[PDB]
Amino acid sequence: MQVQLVESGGGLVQAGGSLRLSCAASGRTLSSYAVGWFRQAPGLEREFVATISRSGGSTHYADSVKGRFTISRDNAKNTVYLQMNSLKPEDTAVYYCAATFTPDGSWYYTRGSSYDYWGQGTQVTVSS
Amino acid sequence: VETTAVQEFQNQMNQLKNKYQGQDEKLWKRSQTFLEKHLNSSHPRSQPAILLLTAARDAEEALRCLSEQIADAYSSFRSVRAIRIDGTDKATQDSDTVKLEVDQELSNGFKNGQNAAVVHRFESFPAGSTLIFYKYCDHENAAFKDVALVLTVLLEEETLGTSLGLKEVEEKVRDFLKVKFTNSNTPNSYNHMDPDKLNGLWSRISHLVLPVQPENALKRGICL
C-alpha cells in the first residue's frame, strides 16, 4: 500500500488571525518521507510554503511566510502540521501537503515536482 | 535565449544525427530539448540533467556509442570528454566497494573540470552500490547540479522493434531494473536496496527515458 495524505484545519479567518493545518498520513510510516506544504489560488502558480526533513531536524520556508508559519511533524502520530499565524489576504489559497521518500534524514524539497504523493487540499480564506 | 554552449552542443548533435540515421526522430528531438534546457538554465541550477537511454540486445553497440557521444556532445563547449563508468566492470563485486569506486570516479571528474558522465550498463551494478546515484541524481540535493549524467540500460530482450510508445518503453526499463536490482541485492552490505530506495532511485533517473535502435554500421564495435 502507498501512503495517503489527508489535510484538515482549513477555514475562514479575518486578517491577523491564525490557523493550524494538519495532515494525517495512512498506509506507511510518515517518518519515511520528507514533507512539504504548497498552496494555490485560482489561476495562479502553485507556490512552495514550507518543507521539513524526515528527522524534523531541517526546515525551510518561503520568504513571504518566514516568521509567521511553522512546519513541524509528529512522526509517532504520523501527522505533519503547519502553524499559520498573523495571516494576510495574500495567504488565501488551497493548501496541499505532499510527501516524498528520501534516504537522507536531513534532506528536504522545495519544488512540487520533487514530490510523489499529495493530499486533496484544504481551503484557507483570509478576509480583508 | 541560446548560448555558445548550446551552439557547440547542437553542432555535435547534428553530426551524430547525420552519422546515426537509424534512430527514432524523437530520440534526437527530446534529448536535445532536455539537455539544451539544462545548458541554458540560470544559475543556481536545482538538478543535474539525467538522461536514461535503453536498448535491446540487437542494439547493444548503438546504445554504447550514442550514449557516450551524446554525453561528450554536452561537454564539447568545455573541450573535455565525459567521465566514463561501466557497470559490466562492477557486477561480480562487493557492493560497498563498488560504491566507493563510482563515487571517487564521478567526484574526481566533476571536481576537476568535467561536466558530464556516461554510466554504461547501469543494470549491471550491484544493487546496493546504485545508492550512490542519490548523491548524484537527487531532485534537489545532488552534489553537482551543473552536470549531465547519461545512464544506459541494456535489456535482455532481443529487440524492441519500432512500434512501442515511450510509456511502454519506460515501463519495460523500470520493470527490468527492479528484477536486476532485486537479484543482485546483498542485504548484508552497508549500502543495500529496499523497495522504497529502489522506487526513489527510479523516480530520480526516469525524467527522460528514450530507446536506441540498432545501427548496422556499428556492428564493427567502433564508434562513428
Side-chain angles (χ1 to χ4, degrees):
Chain A
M1 180 178 23
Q2 313 194 54
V3 67
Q4 309 284 292
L5 304 171
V6 172
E7 305 98 334
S8 59
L12 180 50
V13 74
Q14 302 154 290
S18 289
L19 289 167
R20 182 173 176 80
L21 312 189
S22 75
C23 180
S26 64
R28 299 298 270 281
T29 56
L30 175 73
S31 61
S32 295
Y33 303 91
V35 169
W37 287 94
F38 293 77
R39 67 188 182 185
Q40 190 169 31
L44 299 173
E45 286 228 317
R46 177 187 61 201
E47 190 177 9
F48 167 72
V49 179
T51 177
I52 182 164
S53 65
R54 291 175 60 186
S55 69
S58 295
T59 56
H60 187 75
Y61 297 89
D63 279 10
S64 64
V65 304
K66 201 160 26 230
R68 295 193 298 119
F69 296 7
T70 304
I71 188 170
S72 67
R73 63 193 298 152
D74 183 335
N75 288 329
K77 294 188 173 152
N78 240 43
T79 301
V80 44
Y81 305 95
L82 183 72
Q83 179 77 21
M84 307 175 65
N85 298 331
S86 307
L87 283 165
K88 300 171 185 176
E90 73 185 61
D91 294 318
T92 297
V94 180
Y95 281 70
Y96 299 94
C97 193
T100 204
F101 174 75
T102 180
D104 186 303
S106 64
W107 285 2
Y108 55 66
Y109 300 85
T110 68
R111 305 273 215 91
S113 51
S114 293
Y115 285 88
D116 298 322
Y117 302 103
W118 291 80
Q120 85 285 348
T122 183
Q123 179 75 40
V124 167
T125 300
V126 185
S127 59
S128 50
Chain B
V1 304
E2 182 169 285
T3 55
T4 57
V6 167
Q7 298 183 53
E8 183 59 51
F9 173 66
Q10 289 167 349
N11 181 230
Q12 297 300 324
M13 294 293 285
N14 290 341
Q15 291 182 53
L16 295 183
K17 291 192 264 189
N18 186 47
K19 287 174 178 179
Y20 302 110
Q21 303 179 18
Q23 301 310 309
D24 181 351
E25 281 323 278
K26 302 328 234 199
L27 169 70
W28 306 116
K29 190 138 328 169
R30 293 158 195 266
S31 61
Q32 277 183 254
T33 294
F34 181 73
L35 296 178
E36 292 177 17
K37 176 189 192 201
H38 190 257
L39 279 171
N40 270 135
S41 73
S42 57
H43 290 247
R45 272 77 166 260
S46 73
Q47 187 181 119
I50 306 143
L51 175 70
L52 193 164
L53 300 186
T54 185
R57 295 295 166 170
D58 68 355
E60 180 182 348
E61 303 298 328
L63 180 65
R64 177 168 293 278
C65 288
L66 276 58
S67 61
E68 182 172 287
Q69 294 181 276
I70 288 169
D72 285 344
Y74 186 92
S75 302
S76 53
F77 75 118
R78 291 275 194 81
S79 292
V80 293
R81 291 337 202 167
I83 305 164
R84 289 117 153 85
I85 323 288
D86 194 329
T88 49
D89 291 330
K90 310 301 200 191
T92 59
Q93 309 174 14
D94 177 78
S95 208
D96 296 322
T97 303
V98 176
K99 188 177 182 271
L100 286 168
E101 291 177 10
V102 174
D103 191 23
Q104 185 177 60
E105 293 162 4
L106 293 171
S107 181
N108 197 236
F110 289 146
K111 287 196 309 178
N112 286 282
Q114 287 169 293
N115 67 347
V118 54
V119 179
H120 292 284
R121 299 293 301 273
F122 182 73
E123 83 291 321
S124 292
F125 283 92
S129 70
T130 67
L131 294 172
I132 196 51
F133 289 95
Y134 278 98
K135 176 177 174 177
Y136 288 96
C137 298
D138 185 64
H139 302 308
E140 299 180 36
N141 299 286
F144 299 94
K145 304 164 170 72
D146 308 303
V147 306
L149 294 107
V150 181
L151 278 53
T152 77
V153 174
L154 181 69
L155 309 171
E156 288 175 5
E157 300 186 20
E158 190 45 54
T159 182
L160 282 172
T162 58
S163 307
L164 303 182
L166 284 193
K167 187 72 216 157
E168 189 177 334
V169 170
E170 181 161 332
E171 280 180 357
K172 268 185 182 292
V173 177
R174 179 193 51 178
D175 290 346
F176 173 75
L177 287 178
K178 281 206 36 163
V179 167
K180 290 297 125 185
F181 289 158
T182 303
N183 288 345
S184 64
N185 195 34
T186 48
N188 294 0
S189 296
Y190 178 68
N191 301 277
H192 55 264
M193 190 68 70
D194 67 30
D196 277 353
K197 294 178 182 175
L198 180 55
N199 291 335
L201 182 59
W202 178 248
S203 164
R204 283 153 178 80
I205 69 182
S206 61
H207 305 287
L208 177 53
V209 186
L210 295 164
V212 169
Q213 299 296 326
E215 295 281 4
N216 190 52
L218 286 180
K219 91 174 165 250
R220 278 278 246 177
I222 289 200
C223 296
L224 298 185

